[PDB]
Amino acid sequence: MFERFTDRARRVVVLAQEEARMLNHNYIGTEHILLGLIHEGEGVAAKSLESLGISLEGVRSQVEEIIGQGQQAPSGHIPFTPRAKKVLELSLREALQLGHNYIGTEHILLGLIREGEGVAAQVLVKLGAELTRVRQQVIQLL
Amino acid sequence: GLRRLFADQLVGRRNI
């Protein structure tokens, strides 16, 4: 499925894994995908989140509260949670439906919003960003 | 990859 990602979308999921590693987490969850969308910094997703006041620090602090730092450094490559896999599958479906041949950062964020139930979704709400508007603020930047 | 056993090239893990 990675063959369909833009270079920057690829960067998002690489950074998501890096963030999971830094937190001593054993899975790449939707929350790590969220962190990766922010870390990527340049894409429509990063800009949408920045413009809705959703910060790397805000997300990190919520993840620390909800999940917490793990004790032991995990392996090099960390598997996705089932919910994160579902978000990536939905990201493809967003892009297809919108007539886009590639999956960009925008589509990963749209996919996350569409799944709408994982840790990332919970964090976004705790930080006062209703998921509906994230969709709005996104497709608008588009 | 999108599963569990060993390292994908970039991100995640895969099964045989």
Query: Which among B3, B4, B7 has CB closest to A76?
Result: B7
Which technique was the structure solved with, according to the deposited record?
X-ray
Do the bridges between strand B6-7 and strand B13-14 make them parallel or antiparallel, or are there none, so unpaired?
A: antiparallel
Q: Are residues A13 and A5 in contact, defined by beta-carbon separation less than 8 angstroms?
A: yes
Query: Using a CB-CB distance cutoff of 8 angstroms, which residues of chain B are in contact with residue A36?
Result: none
Whole-number Å distance between alpha carbons of A128 and A64 = 17
Q: Is residue B7 classed as helix, strand or coil in its secondary structure?
A: strand
Main-chain dihedrals φ then ψ at residue A77, nearest 5 degrees? -110, 130
Main-chain dihedrals φ then ψ at residue A70, nearest 5 degrees? -80, 165
- In this complex, is the C-beta atom of A77 within 8 Å of any C-beta atom belonging to chain B? yes
Contact A78 B8 (CB under 8 A): no
Question: Which CATH number, 3.50.50.60, 1.10.1780.10, 1.20.1090.10, 3.20.20.330, labels domain A2-141?
Answer: 1.10.1780.10
Q: What number of C-beta contacts closer than 8 Å exist between A and B?
A: 31
Per-domain residue ranges of chain A: 2-141
Q: What residue has token string 């899975």?
A: A27
Whole-number Å distance between alpha carbons of A118 and A107 = 17
Mutation choice for A interface testing from B3, B6, B8, B11 by most A CBs within 10 A: B11
Whole-number Å distance between alpha carbons of A88 and A85 = 5
